[PDB]
Symmetry: D2
Subunit: 116 residues, 4 copies
């Protein structure tokens, strides 16, 4: 699995469950082409977005739909989403974990990049 997303909820001290995630890749014409999407599991993790063959070099955007998450919990948050934009696989294939820690008016994101 070359691209995994993990989301935590800093209000409840729990995984952030059922968070929608949309991944885009910048096309030759500089538009964002949908690439993959999914939603976090009961563990806060989203696996299976893509394959090693499909996940070529490029600029990717991982959109985490934080507003939709909070509004389901009846909470009115600040951000529309949390966006993570990065160049991937420019020195060959790597495995990426994008992590995000959510609060209503804040978020933190980090990346763990490993070479298989």
């Amino acid at each position: 699995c070359p691209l995994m997303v993990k989301v935590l909820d800093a209000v409840r001290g729990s995984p952030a469950i059922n968070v929608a995630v949309h991944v885009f890749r910048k096309a030759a014409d500089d538009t964002w082409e949908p690439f993959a999407s999914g939603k976090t599991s009961e563990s806060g993790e989203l696996h299976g977005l893509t394959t090693e063959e499909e996940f070529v070099e490029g600029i990717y955007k991982v959109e985490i739909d934080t507003k939709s998450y909070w509004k389901a919990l009846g909470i009115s948050p600040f951000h529309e989403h949390a966006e993570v934009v990065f160049t991937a696989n420019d020195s060959g294939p790597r495995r990426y974990t994008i992590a995000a820690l959510l609060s209503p008016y804040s978020y933190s994101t980090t990346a763990v990049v490993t070479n298989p």
Copy 2:
């Protein structure tokens, strides 16, 4: 000052100086129209982006050029930029501060929304 941006550097424990910041407002056709921009000061702050008259309700994007910041310091970063997307609301308090804390592979952002 309805909108201020502050950027800090978690590697050196310092303001993040001379960071380019671009602000956009979402147009009716869902594109991002340039709205304001500047470079953070010696204190990591960017003031004077807009006025009360011009800063109407709507969705805004603040794009912080973190990659150029790290590259100018000789450091290899993960993200292309940090993006903060939010809705300005007239019901809420008047003044918005968007703060960002930068590391090479991670950033945190929060919003402080206050009244005078």
Copy 3:
């Protein structure tokens, strides 16, 4: 002002007001001797803790009473307090700002060390 503390609330997007802060200095026998204390202001800030003459090199602990803060707001928190322990160095820049961003089950802290 050699030492300032700033506290923000990530649930409401606001300064964290009326937070008790206690500062200690490590004594030669390795105990923590009271040094300074106060409550954050309406802006989330605590100034005037010490003077240049009194703030000599050594190890200091800043203890932010986050549990009482959340309890006064009717919210159930994880931590007893947030502790920030660091060495003051005269080689480094003069002025220390300790900032903390609070959520019920998470906090972030950074140091900004600058010269005038």
Copy 4:
């Protein structure tokens, strides 16, 4: 496993390996009694600190030896350590994950608490 610690490095985008961790528990006399210790693995994770039988109700301190970590990488950081202090098991046994994201002048910590 009722108490697990995970540490990430925000400069390298990697697990923080070989981080020493010391856990203490407040005694009846209000001193901190050593409780358990260990060091993070190649995954940044520390398992096996304690057992369900041993991990009774109490106030615990998880000390993460961040200064020793950075100084091994030849880096001179701000904090002496990152301390996480919390009441555990006060509504019966729970499983705790303490996570920390490290930079030289900052850290973030969160807790995930689950009911088995």
